[PDB]
Amino acid sequence: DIVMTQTPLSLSVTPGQPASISCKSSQSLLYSNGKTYLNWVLQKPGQSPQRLIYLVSKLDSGVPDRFSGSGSGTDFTLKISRVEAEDVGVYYCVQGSHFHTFGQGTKLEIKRTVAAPSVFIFPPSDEQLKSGTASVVCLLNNFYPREAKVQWKVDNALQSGNSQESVTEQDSKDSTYSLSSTLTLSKADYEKHKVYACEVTHQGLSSPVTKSFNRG
């Protein structure tokens, strides 16, 4: 077997600036026919994988020449000279000298300036309530960087373990993220409390922003 060790696991690059990805193999990728079967694939967000580079250094059609591949034996590198927005996604190396195995993947995001989210809170609808459950949703819109803290408070008491968050891929026009956080409470427990607050901490915000409502 040949284990492929890919680093780094993630890259955050300003457009205009270069990106570099290492792939190392646990044994030589030099095949017995004198050729070296190291390939790079890109999987763009929500797409199928597609090959970019084959035989170490050769570009598939339609691949910009900003992309280059190098190396030999156990050591290979993918370089992107001047990142552009279309480069975003997960890169994998994949050897074909002994069957196939893949690198663990390198997630490329575009670096951009800080942008604070705008925040919205939605109570559970009346239709949901009938049925036994209450979902309280907090939406964070168009922010960068990805890192954010979203905290729920019910009549001032900090919740834990009862919310789940979900994040979009980088917006393809402005490179920001959006996030939703959903608090699950029983219907009876929802109707027993008054003040529902989503508090958001993020480096684009002077101090934490709170969106809240009262059940009435």
Partner: peptide
């Protein structure tokens, strides 16, 4: 429009929200 990645609940069922600003 932002249609979020589904999340798996403790129930074993999935949920997601789709929003528009």
């Amino acid at each position: 429009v932002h249609t979020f990645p589904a999340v798996l609940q403790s129930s074993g069922l999935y949920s997601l929200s789709s929003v528009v600003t």
